[PDB]
Amino acid sequence: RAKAKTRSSRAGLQFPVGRVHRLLRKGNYAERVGAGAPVYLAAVLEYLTAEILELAGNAARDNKKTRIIPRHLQLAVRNDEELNKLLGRVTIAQGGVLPNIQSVLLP
Amino acid sequence: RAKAKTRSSRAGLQFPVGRVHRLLRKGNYAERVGAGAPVYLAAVLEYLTAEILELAGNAARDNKKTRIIPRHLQLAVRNDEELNKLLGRVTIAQGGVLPNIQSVLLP
Amino acid sequence: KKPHRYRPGTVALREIRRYQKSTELLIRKLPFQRLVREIAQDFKTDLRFQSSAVMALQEASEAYLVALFEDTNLAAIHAKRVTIMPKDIQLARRIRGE
Amino acid sequence: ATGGVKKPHRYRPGTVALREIRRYQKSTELLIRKLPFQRLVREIAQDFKTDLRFQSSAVMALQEASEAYLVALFEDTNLAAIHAKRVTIMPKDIQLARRIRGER
Amino acid sequence: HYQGWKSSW
Amino acid sequence: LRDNIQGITKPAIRRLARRGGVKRISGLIYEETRGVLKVFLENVIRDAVTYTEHAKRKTVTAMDVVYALKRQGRTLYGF
Amino acid sequence: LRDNIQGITKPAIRRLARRGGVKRISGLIYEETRGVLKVFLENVIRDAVTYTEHAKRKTVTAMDVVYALKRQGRTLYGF
Amino acid sequence: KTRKESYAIYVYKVLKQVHPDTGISSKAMSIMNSFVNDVFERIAGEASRLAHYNKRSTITSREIQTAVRLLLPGELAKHAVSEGTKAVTKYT
Amino acid sequence: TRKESYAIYVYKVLKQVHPDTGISSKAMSIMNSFVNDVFERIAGEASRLAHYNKRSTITSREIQTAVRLLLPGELAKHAVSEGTKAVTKYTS
DNA sequence: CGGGGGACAGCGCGTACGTGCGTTTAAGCGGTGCTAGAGCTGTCTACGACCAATTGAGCGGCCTCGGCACCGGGATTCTCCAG
DNA sequence: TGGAGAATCCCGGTGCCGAGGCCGCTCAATTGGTCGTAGACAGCTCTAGCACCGCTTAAACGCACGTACGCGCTGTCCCCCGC
């Protein structure tokens, strides 16, 4: 009414809080949805997105590109064992796998 | 009011329609819950319970046992192909595994 | 005519090095869509499939086949072998629970 | 006596093993002793919240779940041994089963 | 006494 | 239309295995691969048909395929 | 308490294999079996610890144990 | 002390209906109770995500029918929904 | 009509963590589906955690437990640190 | 269709658990004692829901562009050489 | 051990198709009130978990000989690979 400042900017988060709160209320996941819970979820989503985008940018620097393609995202996810454990039963479209060569198959 | 009659007897069912409705409403699965959904869920649960207990009794009839023990339930679950497919990621306590021997192991 | 023909097994590694890092798809769109129509004909008829749904189905099937082929190759090199077999696929299916 | 100086019945390697398989896949009892399992449970909680209690029902549930997972892994290992034209199981078969299942 | 091996008792 | 399991091409199966790092391919691999692809495809298509028939729809959208893959624990991104 | 990883005895692993249908047992299977058992046990135990600090509880309940098992897709029935 | 929700008498009368001379032990009955609860949770979650997909705030018998066709494979679901069908045919 | 998406927010994250790179539209859809899937998993875990102990609300501890359950290890504890930093920034 | 090569069977070594026995030892039964927080319920109190008003950045759409993909040329490099 | 085949890499230039940036608007985002209500919170039981000990005996540790499967080396020719 006086000055509408976003609560995501109050916590220093780029990811929204009102959208997360509205989606939590719309799905009826609980009778009440707290105040710090969407902020925590937005911060965790921001950290995950920043880490995955940083790994994808590193892979794009390795293969000399500046635009992140689905192959770069797949390589970033499947490179470290942390995201491999997290995204174990998750597949990514428009992407392959690591170009690993077995020692026995090598001539 | 009038004479109290349960919805399970009106629908020809043994599983409680009202208890399933209570767990559906308090389980925050949806904002609004239909009248036929607890009846359908109770019918499905009753049919699955009757089929599993009948299979357990059939597996325990040749074992000279008149009581259902967890080994009988495990045998009934893993012997049926569709029950094995549905309960693929299901662990049954005190049940073990099926007593099958491979052909190469037998001399 | 051919002075060299490339000993067997190394062209396979050439296609491996080309296609593990590749991005374009391998299964052709038209026969996969036709197989989708044949499969859906056994189910409820007069059914349609949009381009995005067919693309998602093709990507999921190719990813599942790639994972199954990786498991099959791992089982083949596990058995002191190099060639993959249908029994290796059956073993992978039994281990994975599918 | 025993047909002269002789020796025990002396079953060949494998026969009493299938006897153990037959008698032991149907008695559905517990294969790991409870106090060593509870001691191992309390050991691997020392890098965790240290002052933590464990219920008897929770200990039994964990023991049963780990036992079922281990016998499923052993079934996978035996099928991988038969896959490799072998009878004995190797740790590389366990590694193969865990990698195919997605746990390695 | 079962010296060495169980035998036929 | 009635016989379309031959539409899955054998060198396409070869390319799929080359993406998987397979060096040597036997001749009996192709039929088993077609069979497992057929049963997986018919399971996912049956799930998508049920999903699109709950919504009183006659065309299957990509979101139906995504939710069908999420039901079996094989969630795919991008759609 | 400092060292009881040897508590899972070798004949216990032998009986585990006899339930699993194994005919012959090697000497190197025990260390890897104990290692993967330790990994799975510590994963489920850390999940149960997270569940028990969710509700300010110092003890681990079997209900939380089977919930943690259901979280990883290995749900246990009867607790 | 406090009352606890359980599926004891319902599973027991179903068992007596299908097997008049067969009982059940406590451990196996706890397994059956947990099985009923887990199938209830799975069907409720499937119907919830089905209703959230269609922007539907109401879960009817059609959502339960769709969830049973989805989660339960083969013909085992079909007879089940057929039972649900006659359940509705006995309710209406 | 309107379509809810996280595309522009992910763009701000990208320019705040990598000011010299871009991202394609298919990769944008992959990012949107990834964010939706992680949000779905964490929200479902938090709702289950609230349901188990007769809690009708979702607090910061619910998302704390969901993150320490679903997200593994080092990634999980950095997410925990980021969430606690955001909570402290809100409370300040 | 021509060439490669290795799966499977065979033969031979070998060795290491298999089975059993002598010896160890702690799992478990059972008991008693102590006690930490599950759990229970009354009480206080901020908090999310709800609603009315306001304002504000994402959405839709549009304009310009620049790196992705590709088409010509040229070389480094794997492979198999017969030497 | 210096040439071919095939194949990838590099490079300059160009088409162009989404990629990225900018303007109105609105509907979802933010702000300001109450208020039942669910959640902390603190004083009670007391349930079941933790700790120590006698005994024993069956599970388990270590040793003794053996054979049967694991493993090393060959041949066929049939199946698979390159074109």
Residue numbers in the entry:
A (entry chain Q), B (entry chain U): 11 to 117
C (entry chain S): 36 to 133
D (entry chain O): 31 to 134
E (entry chain D): 80 to 88
F (entry chain T), G (entry chain P): 22 to 100
H (entry chain V): 28 to 119
I (entry chain R): 29 to 120
Provide excerpts from the study.
In Saccharomyces cerevisiae, cryptic transcription at the coding region is prevented by the activity of Sin3 histone deacetylase (HDAC) complex Rpd3S, which is carried by the transcribing RNA polymerase II (RNAPII) to deacetylate and stabilize chromatin. The five-subunit Rpd3S complex contains a unique subunit Rco1, three core subunits (Rpd3, Sin3, and Ume1) that are shared between the 12-subunit Rpd3L complex, and an Eaf3 subunit that is also a component of the NuA4 histone acetyltransferase (HAT).
In the alternative deacetylation state, Rpd3S is freed from being constrained by the Eaf3B-entry linker interaction and rotates by ~90° along the plane of the nucleosomal disc relative to the H3/H4 deacetylation states to bind to the top side of the NCP via multiple contacts. On nucleosomal DNA, the conserved Sin3 basic surface and the MRGA-PHDA arm bind to the phosphodiester backbone of the SHL + 5 and SHL + 1.5 of the NCP, respectively. The CHD of Eaf3A continues to interact with the H3K36MLA tails and engages the nucleosomal DNA at SHL + 7. At SHL – 7, the Eaf3B CHD is no longer visible, although the density of the H3K36MLA tail is still present. On Rpd3S, Rco1A AIM leaves HIM and becomes largely invisible, while the conserved R384 fits into an acidic pocket created by H2A (E61/E92) and H2B (E102) at the acidic patch, hence the naming of the AIM. The interaction between Rpd3S and the acidic patch is further confirmed by the finding that a Chd1 ChEx peptide, a known acidic-patch binding peptide, is able to compete Rpd3S away from the NCP. Cryo-EM image processing of Rpd3S–NCP167bp/MLA reveals that the number of particles with Rpd3S binding to the SHL + 2 position is four times more than that at the SHL + 5 position. Therefore, it is likely that Rpd3S has a higher affinity towards the NCP at SHL + 2 and that this position is the first point of Rpd3S contact on the H3K36 trimethylated NCP. The repositioning at SHL + 5 is likely guided by Rco1A AIM’s interaction with the acidic patch and Eaf3A CHD interaction with H3K36MLA at SHL + 7.
